[PDB]
Amino acid sequence: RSASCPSL
Amino acid sequence: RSASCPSL
Amino acid sequence: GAMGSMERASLIQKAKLAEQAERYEDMAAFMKGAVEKGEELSCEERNLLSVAYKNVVGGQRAAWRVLSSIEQKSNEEEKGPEVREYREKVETELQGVCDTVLGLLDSHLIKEAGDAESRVFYLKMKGDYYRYLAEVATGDKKRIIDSARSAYQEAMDISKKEMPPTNPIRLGLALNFSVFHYEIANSPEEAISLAKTTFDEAMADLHTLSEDSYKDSTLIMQLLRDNLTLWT
Amino acid sequence: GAMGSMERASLIQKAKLAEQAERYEDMAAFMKGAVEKGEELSCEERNLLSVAYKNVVGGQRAAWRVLSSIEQKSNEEEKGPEVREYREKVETELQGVCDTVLGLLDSHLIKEAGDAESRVFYLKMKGDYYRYLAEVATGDKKRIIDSARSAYQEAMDISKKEMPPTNPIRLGLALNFSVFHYEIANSPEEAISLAKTTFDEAMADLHTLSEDSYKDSTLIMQLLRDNLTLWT
Ligand SMILES: *C[C@@H](C*)C(=O)OCC
Ligand SMILES: *C[C@@H](C*)C(=O)OCC
Ligand SMILES: [Cl-]
Ligand SMILES: [Cl-]
Ligand SMILES: [Cl-]
Ligand SMILES: [Cl-]
Ligand SMILES: [Cl-]
Ligand SMILES: [Cl-]
Ligand SMILES: [Mg+2]
Ligand SMILES: [Mg+2]
């Protein structure tokens, strides 16, 4: 799975 | 801290 | 609301405490409370709002994926309605949290946002929360997908005019929009092209940054590169 | 109840799904539902009950400690009532979960438990939930401490008569009772003596076990030894 922008 | 019995 | 009797500054203080205790659900309720006071949010406040809800929704999305996967495996021995019921339960809660965030954006965070920083921030948030709705949508998926695209594109237009290419939110917006293209809109080529051009334009602007700004931009740039390595 | 309309077997199935999705709060509500059907729990069901609530309460205990520590640091610049208010909020929820578990044990899990396995299990649970109340008690701490001790001692008496020394629940009971002595009752010597004698008696009974039983006992034995290394 692609990584989205993490919390932060 | 002391370890208690973990969940399992 | 339940937070209607608490001071704005007290809600913000409690949100920071909830963050330290990893009580993200409490953190989210405090920040909803803060937003409903009707004053514009500072940069630090927007960040708290964002962290609270991303963590709450993050937990629900992960559970949902675990359950969908068990459900799909069962549609290859008959086990009754329980898997579908529970998946629907988690899904419904997920949709309520997304509906809460989008309601806040619509009443009245977005329309009061005049500065590029705040406006981009709120439009990106809107894109992300429609994207999360899209991940679980089956029967309306098309309108949801288009609402996501439209919020992301509007944010991209402002970020391109008003912000330098290394600005962390401009970068994080592009990363999330590229994930939208790849995972939701079925456009891997659009995804790869956006990630590459975003990375290249930031690279060429690193020289303008202080060491601290430099560290913030390059962290997001690494995630763009990680996805490009996955997608290619 | 809210679970009163769902089948017992459906609640158990959903509890297992909630466990896989790490939705411990849902898992706890399903298992409460299952218990309130009024039938005795099997071994696997008791385990689900135990995992659900230990995880829910585990999260609250960790938040509480984070907050108490901030609160104590503030009683060494004046910041207002927020830290105390929030600590009290988390504390109150923690006490409600413990009160829920102890209510279930009292209506009617313990009194229906005839076999040593079930009875020890339920009494240990009772000890642990009073121990968690004791961790946060200030003004009644003494009665709470004594209710914990009394449940643990009753379980220890049955476990010593009815179970082999390597039985995982006998071992886990002794470990938790030793932590009670060390962290709650202020009796580090009692703690060390119980841990040592428990470890030694299990060691001498390992030879009777299959390879699988052997692996289960030795895991708990390592935690006894880890505490002994900390306490000595
Ligand atoms: C991760 C979020 C979308 C963002 O842009 O953060 C800036 C560091
Ligand atoms: C951890 C719990 C108290 C217990 O005894 O588990 C048996 C493995
Ligand atoms: Cl939470
Ligand atoms: Cl359900
Ligand atoms: Cl829009
Ligand atoms: Cl949970
Ligand atoms: Cl509070
Ligand atoms: Cl008792
Ligand atoms: Mg078959
Ligand atoms: Mg001072």
Author numbering:
A (entry chain P), B (entry chain P): 86 to 93
C (entry chain A), D (entry chain A): -4 to 71, 75 to 137, 139 to 231
From the paper:
Methacrylate phosphopeptides derived from 14-3-3-binding proteins irreversibly label 14-3-3σ via either lysine or cysteine residues, depending on the position of the electrophile.
Significant covalent labeling of 14-3-3σ with the expected adduct mass was observed for the peptides 3 (51%), 8 (35%), and 11 (57%), all of which were predicted to bind Lys122. We analyzed these peptides further using time course labeling experiments at lower peptide concentrations (5 µM) at 25 °C. Peptides 3 and 8 reached 60% and 80% labeling within 5 h, respectively. Peptide 3 remained unmodified even after 3 days. In contrast, peptides containing or following Lys122 were significantly depleted by peptides 3 and 8, albeit not uniformly, while the signals of Lys49 containing peptides were slightly increased. This result pointed to Lys122 as the likely binding site for peptides 3 and 8. To further confirm that Lysine 122 is the target residue for peptides 3 and 8, we co-crystallized 14-3-3σ with both peptides. While peptide 12 labeled only the sigma isoform, peptides 3 and 8 labeled all isoforms with similar efficiencies, Taken together these results conclusively validate that peptides 3 and 8 specifically bind to Lys122 via aza-Michael addition.
